[PDB]
């Protein structure tokens, strides 16, 4: 997936392989092997072939791929881009209002009289009133380096769809 770094429904190598299987008609032979009672020793192998055919897909999305899905997904992509962009703009404005409208080196320091520092004296704050408006006592800190044996597990896959023609073929299969 460094080289197959491919977008939502661009045909991956696996998609092209499945489409080649469809065009060659070997899917019909796999169906014959699974449906026929005469050669059931190959049923385990054919199960393995089918399990390797379906890897990106999940059944709930696959069963709903009607013939008119392409136009729907065009409009859905435009809507998703619109909401993503609006969300990013909102996040940008929250960050912009968090910091001040003066430049970074515009100095000035404050004392919060009612708030003890880690010592006995009151805390001296340097990042401006706009950072004090929503004050947090970990603004300047970095995260901790959790060790390797303590780190949480992560997802081995992300849901790129296969190409729509391949999705139609897989639904029919």
């Amino acid at each position: 997936l460094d080289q197959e770094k491919k977008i939502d429904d661009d045909a991956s190598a696996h998609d092209q392989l499945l489409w080649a299987i469809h065009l060659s008609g070997l899917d019909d032979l796999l169906l014959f092997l699974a449906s026929s009672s005469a050669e059931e020793q190959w049923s385990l192998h054919v199960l393995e072939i089918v399990s390797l055919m379906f890897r990106d897909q999940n059944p709930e999305q696959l069963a709903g791929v009607g013939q008119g899905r392409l136009a729907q997904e065009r409009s859905a992509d435009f809507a998703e881009l619109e909401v993503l962009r609006q969300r990013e703009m909102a996040e940008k404005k929250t960050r912009a209002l968090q910091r001040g409208n003066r430049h970074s080196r515009f100095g000035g320091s404050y004392i919060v009289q009612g708030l003890k520092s880690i010592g006995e004296r009151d805390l001296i704050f340097h990042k401006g009133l706009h950072n004090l408006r929503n004050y947090s006592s970990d603004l300047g800190k970095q995260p901790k380096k959790v060790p390797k044996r303590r780190q949480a597990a992560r997802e081995l896959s992300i849901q790129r769809r296969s190409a729509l023609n391949v999705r139609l073929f897989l639904r029919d299969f």
Binding site: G107, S117, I118, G119, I124, H126, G140
Partner: protein
């Protein structure tokens, strides 16, 4: 050799006790009057005259002329130690608040002292300032070829720590210095707090500084 503590005490004696009959015979203690003015901050610069010092200790004048920087420091320290006896803007506000915290001597020092040279010393030309006169008070004549604009020279830098709310001070002597970064106070070091220091130009002592070049007539 010298016992600079005894020298400081003798300097205190001179400053306390000298009088010169100014204003037609009023017997004014000139340095006591100027000490009152310094203590009240109505005066900032004190030009002590070594001709006046010669009238009760020529040996002290010789020691000053031979080791002038040391005695400049000693005279300044004696004056600062004597200002409360005669104590009848922004940095003043900061010194007031630091006194409130008490309730950095060079920062709290808000005056300056200079030696007006003795008349026995002939005014040299620039060429006659030999290497034997290094560290010694000399009088030099010349034409002022060029003068720079007045610039602020840091005397005592003042920092504030973000994590522990403590002020730290850094006296400056050399023409260059290392600005402090991480907080040295033990409440930061022992707690490994990662607290850093921000220079406070408002609450740090600057001084007017000017570079010029004299030239021979």
């Amino acid at each position: 050799l010298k016992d600079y503590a005894l020298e400081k005490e003798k300097v205190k004696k001179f400053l306390q006790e000298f009088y010169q009959d100014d204003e037609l015979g009023k017997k004014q203690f000139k340095y006591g009057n100027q000490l009152v003015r310094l203590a009240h901050r109505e005066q900032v610069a004190l030009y002590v005259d070594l001709d006046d010092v010669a009238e009760d200790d020529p040996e002290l004048v010789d020691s000053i002329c031979e080791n002038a920087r040391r005695y400049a420091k000693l005279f300044a320290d004696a004056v600062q130690e004597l200002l409360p006896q005669y104590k009848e803007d922004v940095l003043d506000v900061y010194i007031e608040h630091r006194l409130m915290m008490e309730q950095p001597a060079e920062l709290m020092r808000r005056f300056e002292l200079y030696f007006q040279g003795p008349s026995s010393n002939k005014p040299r030309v620039i060429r006659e300032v030999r290497a034997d006169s290094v560290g010694k008070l000399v009088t030099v004549r010349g034409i002022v070829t060029r003068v720079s604009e007045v610039k602020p020279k840091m005397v005592v830098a003042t920092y504030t720590c973000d994590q522990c709310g403590a002020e730290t001070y850094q006296p400056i002597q050399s023409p260059t210095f290392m600005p402090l970064i991480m907080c040295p106070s033990q409440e930061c070091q022992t707690n490994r707090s990662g607290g850093r220091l921000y220079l406070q130009t408002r609450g740090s002592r600057f001084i007017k500084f000017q570079e010029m070049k004299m030239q021979e007539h």
